[PDB]
Ligand binder design. Structure first.
Ligand SMILES: CC(C)CCC[C@@H](C)[C@H]1CC[C@H]2[C@@H]3CC=C4C[C@@H](O)CC[C@]4(C)[C@H]3CC[C@]12C
Ligand SMILES: CC(C)CCC[C@@H](C)[C@H]1CC[C@H]2[C@@H]3CC=C4C[C@@H](O)CC[C@]4(C)[C@H]3CC[C@]12C
Ligand SMILES: CCCCCCC(C)(C)c1ccc([C@@H]2C[C@H](O)CC[C@H]2CCCO)c(O)c1
Ligand SMILES: Cc1ccc2c([C@@H](C[N+](=O)[O-])c3cccs3)c(-c3ccccc3)[nH]c2c1
Ligand SMILES: CCCCCCCC/C=C/CCCCCCCC(=O)OC[C@H](O)CO
Ligand SMILES: CCCCCCCC/C=C\CCCCCCCC(=O)OC[C@H](O)CO
Length: 486
């Protein structure tokens, strides 16, 4: 009885009473879960000055409201239509459906603003607090929400199959198929780009790395800066002098123990060598490992170490030793440099990869890789600089390391919580955006109408799992909620 383009609204009521009771109870319990969780998310954010001031939680707050407002309007209208068989006019029905559409596109746009926010953090790292001001983020969210609702109000104002005498959708009453066409594409292109963006943010974040500062904390030093040095040197060197430590492997053309072994030889003729002391550590290529051990007893002020050392034994090594040399050819992550600066060792390093990004002029001395003579000058510039008080510089490494590590470790987490929110949105709404595309070109049998009715519950699942993501993936939410509820 419903083959007409202007079909009766009864033919969208595609569910049988046992099916309605199941969908109803599932809608109510699932919806009740979303309500309780999302108002809890908002209350934690809204009632804390330290939270609501960050545009990161304007974004979390945005998703919370987008979930809360859309799901509540949906569950009320969805089951009122299906179980109570509501017979609302074309305007009021399109008005209720509009509230559900505005809420979803607001989430795609809230995801979109976050993608832009991270994009400019990667492309212009130095200008981020000035370009993403809190007020700029507030209005960027504000208008985004308005453009969202405007798209939702177009059918109400006349873009529908009744006012236009066009073709009606078989899923959505009164809705024009051409407006349906337009709506999928607009969120499909955003969601598609957001997918590309979020993968790029996650790749770029993993290009940097940080260390656990608990293991590499200075608090574990048991002795003064000069005395803790003397004793460790006393175990072998038994003298007081500036010490240059190396901790890597003995490959040729990678970590740069080759460049170091050539360097040390040309400092040996100089008189100032006696002030210097060196400690080489690691295991590697048999041709050059003996080269170091041929030099452990030839000059006698150097301990080369071939066997491994526990990561908790070397924390005291980094703190007492005056200098660490990183003559690497490739170092996208200066993890060894980070652990040294985190214990106060001043780093002389190659200008390669992270070493260049981490160490600046105020923290250490940078030398072109592959030139051992330039390295020989580095520890000579480190000799004339060692006599003058360099504790004013020793602490530049103390805070540069602990701050660089926390920006790299942070950015990793944002990139993870982002994609977590994305994938759950895709597998919840992907099926829904597929059944509508099957409607744009095609026809809905009574079956595809029924499964889409049952599949519409996914929008309430998505709204319920999002607060769980924030709860697990945000130590800040946790401490705020924890302090509110002892
Ligand atoms: C009308 C029915 C269906 C829903 C009622 C709840 C509405 C009115 C509530 C729920 C959550 C609320 C939002 C929660 C937080 C903020 C951020 C604040 O900086 C401005 C107000 C704003 C944006 C609120 C506006 C009103 C709001 C959207
Ligand atoms: C379909 C919907 C989701 C599209 C959303 C469009 C969003 C991403 C666009 C539309 C209007 C835009 C804003 C318009 C003007 C300004 C002021 C400017 O000084 C900074 C950028 C800012 C704040 C823009 C940010 C991005 C913005 C909010
Ligand atoms: C028009 C843009 C689509 C937005 C997706 C909304 C969603 C997929 C969640 C949805 C919306 C509406 C319905 C029901 C379809 C029935 O054909 C008629 C009654 C609708 C519920 C009342 C909406 O206020 C749905 O199953 C899924
Ligand atoms: C039952 C109900 C409650 C609220 C709404 C809204 C607005 C809120 N206000 O009352 O209009 C919003 C819903 C979600 C975010 S904003 C629309 C709406 C939105 C845009 C265009 C057309 C209609 N329909 C609704 C239906
Ligand atoms: C549920 C959806 C609503 C979301 C609203 C947020 C609710 C988060 C409350 C969480 C569990 C409490 C766990 C205890 C909190 C501390 C966890 C922690 O990691 O503490 C580490 C600490 O720094 C050690 O030094
Ligand atoms: C129809 C409704 C449209 C939906 C729109 C959703 C936008 C909400 C986004 C985020 C919440 C983040 C919390 C923002 C609260 C900031 C309050 C604040 O910080 O006040 C400053 C003052 O200085 C304090 O002491």
């Amino acid at each position: 009885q419903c083959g007409e383009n202007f079909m009766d609204i009864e033919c969208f009521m595609v569910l049988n009473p046992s099916q309605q009771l199941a969908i109803a109870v599932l809608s109510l319990t699932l919806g009740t879960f979303t309500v309780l969780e999302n108002l809890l998310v908002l209350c934690v954010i809204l009632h804390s000055r330290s939270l609501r001031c960050r545009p990161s939680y304007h974004f979390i707050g945005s998703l919370a409201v987008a979930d809360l407002l859309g799901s509540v309007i949906f569950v009320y209208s969805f089951i009122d239509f299906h179980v109570f068989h509501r017979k609302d006019s074309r305007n009021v029905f399109l008005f209720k459906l509009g509230g559900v559409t505005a809420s979803f596109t607001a989430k795609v746009g809230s995801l979109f603003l976050a993608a832009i926010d991270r994009y400019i953090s990667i492309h212009r790292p130095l200008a981020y607090k000035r370009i993403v001001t809190r007020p700029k983020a507030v209005v960027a969210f504000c208008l985004m929400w308005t453009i969202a609702i405007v798209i939702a109000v177009l059918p109400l104002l006349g873009w529908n199959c009744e006012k236009l005498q066009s073709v009606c959708s078989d899923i959505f009453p009164h809705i024009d198929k051409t407006y349906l066409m337009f709506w999928i594409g607009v969120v499909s292109v955003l969601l598609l780009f957001i997918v590309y963006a979020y993968m790029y943010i996650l790749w770029k974040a993993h290009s940097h790395a940080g260390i656990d500062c608990s293991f590499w904390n200075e608090s574990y030093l048991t002795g003064s800066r000069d005395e803790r040095k003397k004793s460790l040197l006393s175990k072998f060197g038994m003298d007081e002098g500036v010490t240059f430590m190396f901790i890597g492997r003995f490959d040729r053309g990678q970590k740069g123990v080759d460049v170091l072994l050539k360097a040390i030889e040309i400092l040996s003729s100089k008189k100032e060598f006696q002030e210097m002391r060196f400690i080489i550590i690691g295991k590697g290529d048999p041709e050059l490992e003996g080269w170091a051990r041929s030099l452990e007893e030839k000059h006698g002020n150097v301990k080369v170490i071939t066997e491994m050392l526990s990561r908790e034994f070397v924390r005291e090594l980094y703190g007492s030793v005056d200098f660490v040399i990183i003559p690497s050819y490739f170092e996208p992550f200066g993890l060894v440099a980070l652990e040294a600066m985190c214990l106060g060792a001043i780093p002389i390093a190659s200008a390669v990869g992270g070493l260049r990004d981490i160490i600046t002029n105020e923290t250490g001395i940078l030398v072109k890789a592959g030139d051992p003579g330039e390295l020989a000058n580095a520890i000579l510039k480190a000799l004339e600089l060692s006599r003058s008080d360099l504790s004013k510089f020793r602490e530049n490494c103390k805070k540069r390391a602990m701050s660089f590590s926390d920006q790299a470790r942070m950015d990793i987490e944002l990139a993870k919580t982002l994609v977590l929110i994305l994938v759950v949105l895709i597998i919840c709404w992907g099926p829904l955006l597929a059944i509508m595309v099957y409607d744009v070109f095609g026809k809905m049998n009574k079956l595809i109408k029924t499964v889409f009715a049952f599949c519409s519950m996914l929008c309430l699942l998505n709204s319920t799992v999002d607060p769980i993501i924030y709860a697990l993936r945000s130590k800040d939410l946790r401490h705020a909620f924890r302090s509110m509820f002892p």
